[PDB]
Amino acid sequence: NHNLHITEKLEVLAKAYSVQGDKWRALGYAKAINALKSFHKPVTSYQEACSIPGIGKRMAEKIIEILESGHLRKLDHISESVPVLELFSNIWGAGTKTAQMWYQQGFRSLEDIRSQASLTTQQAIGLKHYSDFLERMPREEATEIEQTVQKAAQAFNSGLLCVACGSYRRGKATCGDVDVLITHPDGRSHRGIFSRLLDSLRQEGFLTDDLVKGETKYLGVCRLPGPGRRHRRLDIIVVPYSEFACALLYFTGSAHFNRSMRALAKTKGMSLSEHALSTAVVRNTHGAKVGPGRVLPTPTEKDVFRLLGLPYREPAERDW
DNA sequence: CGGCAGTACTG
DNA sequence: CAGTACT
DNA sequence: GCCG
Ligand SMILES: [Mn+2]
Ligand SMILES: [Mn+2]
Ligand SMILES: [Mn+2]
Ligand SMILES: [Mn+2]
Ligand code: NA
Ligand code: NA
Ligand code: NA
């Protein structure tokens, strides 16, 4: 990154807008930061700044202040609430609205939350694992977690296919959590497995807490056995084989990669989701779907790229 | 002016 | 529904 | 915040 001296201060504002709930302004900052991190050389003129997609007048002005003066004065006017709002919204299950409510009610520390806040079931689990959920794991540990889920699943049906997606499949050396996708080539055998699979993992002691238990998605907490182990976030999704390619693409990400791909599809009158790539999608002036369109056959990730007119990218090239 | 991805889950 | 979460 |  050629422009650390710029992006480092912009990311402070981005985080401030994000925890205060100004999601679209924060999105603009996030994109401009990526755009700056993707530029070969350091940026040296306001005209070069606008050069970059994702950099407008206001962002170019901010970059110039940074280069001429070495600082951005807006940083000196960030609300004193922001560190606390960040502290609170790092509780799993608490976002900007809950953080702002707790702040308005006078809470300033996790001790205040522990002792005085009403917590949802999810948030109480988030708080108990506050430190652990901010820690990443070595990818070798993600491998052990993936293999634990697969062994429990294959015990029920040898035909079940389990793959760790997210940062793991993109090849990262550390992982924030483990994202396991499960399907069955027979197109049927994936149905109703969650009850038995989660019970199998829970009877081990491996599954320690449940956050979300849906018919297709599980989000929870696990811990491998023995000393020196931390609690880790584990997500599981079970999908029909018909949707494997789009589910794999979704679950491998990155998030910004997915959003970019889905935006591209929309420009082409198509729609991309974890379920399917669809064509002839009908939308209104506001960009919302009014007519469903037709699911396109996508047996492989390659097929999704091809139908969108894009060259295939390995998971490691999706780490946007 | 107004979209900025599309979906699942909780209560 | 609003809120939060997933990539 | 940016951009069509
Ligand atoms: Mn992940
Ligand atoms: Mn995850
Ligand atoms: Mn722990
Ligand atoms: Mn993530
Ligand atoms: Na630009
Ligand atoms: Na949170
Ligand atoms: Na009090």
- Matching CATH number, A4-76, of 1.10.150.110, 2.60.120.330, 3.40.920.10, 1.20.120.80: 1.10.150.110
Is the distance from CB of A320 to CB of A257 less than 8 angstroms? yes
CA A50 to chain centre: 29
CA A100 to C1' C1, in angstroms, rounded, equals 20
Cα–Cα distance measured from residue A147 to residue A219, given in angstroms and rounded to the nearest whole number: 17
**CATH 3.30.210.10, chain A: domain bounds:** 246-317
The 10 Å Cβ neighbour count of residue A231 is 18
Closest nucleotide over all strands to A49 (CA to C1'): D2
Instruction: Report residue A223 as tokens.
Output: 């811990």
CB A180 within 8 A of CB A236: yes
Superfamily in which the A246-317 domain is placed by CATH: DNA polymerase, thumb domain (3.30.210.10)
Both tokens of residue A239? 């999908």
| A43 Cβ contact list (under 8 Å, min separation 6) | A2, A3, A6, A36, A49, A51, A52, A63, A67
Q: Please tell me whether any atom of strand C lies within 7 Å of the Cβ of A221.
A: no
Compute how many other C-beta atoms are within 10 angstroms of the C-beta atom of residue A258: 19
Query: A219 by DSSP, 3-state: which?
Result: strand
- Could you tell me the distance in Å between the CA of residue A72 and the C1' of nucleotide B1? 30
Report phi then psi at A282, rounded to 5: -100, 130
Rounded to the nearest angstrom, the distance between the alpha carbon of A220 and the centre of ligand 2 is: 9
d(CA A66, CA A5): 8
Residue range(s) occupied by CATH 3.30.460.10 in chain A: 137-245
Protein contacts of strand B with Cβ less than 7 Å away: A 24, 27-28, 120-122, 212-217, 250, 255, 258-259, 262-263, 265-266, 271-275, 285-287, 289
The class level of CATH for A81-134 reads: mainly alpha
Q: Active-site residue A57, yes or no? A: no
Ligand 6: distance of its center to the CA of A178 in Å?
Answer: 17
Q: Write down the experimental method used for this entry.
A: X-ray
Are A249 and A181 in contact by the 8 Å Cβ rule? The answer is no
Residues by chain with Cβ below 5 Å of ion ligand 1: A 166, 177, 179
Query: How far apart (Å, rounded) are the C-alpha atoms in residues A192 and A160?
Result: 13
Residues of chain A with CATH 1.10.150.110: 4-76
Nearest Cα to A146, choosing from A161, A128, A156?
Answer: A161
Every domain of chain A with CATH number 1.10.150.20 lies at: 81-134
Architecture field, domain A137-245: 2-Layer Sandwich (3.30)
Extract the annotated binding site of A for dCTP.
136, 167-170, 176-179, 258
Dump strand ranges (E) for chain A.
137-138, 161-164, 174-175, 178-183, 207-213, 217-222, 232-238, 270-272, 277-279, 282-283, 289-291, 294-296
Nearest nucleotide from residue A212 CA, by C1' atom = B9
Report which of A91, A235, A256 is spatially closest to residue A102, judged by C-alpha positions: A91
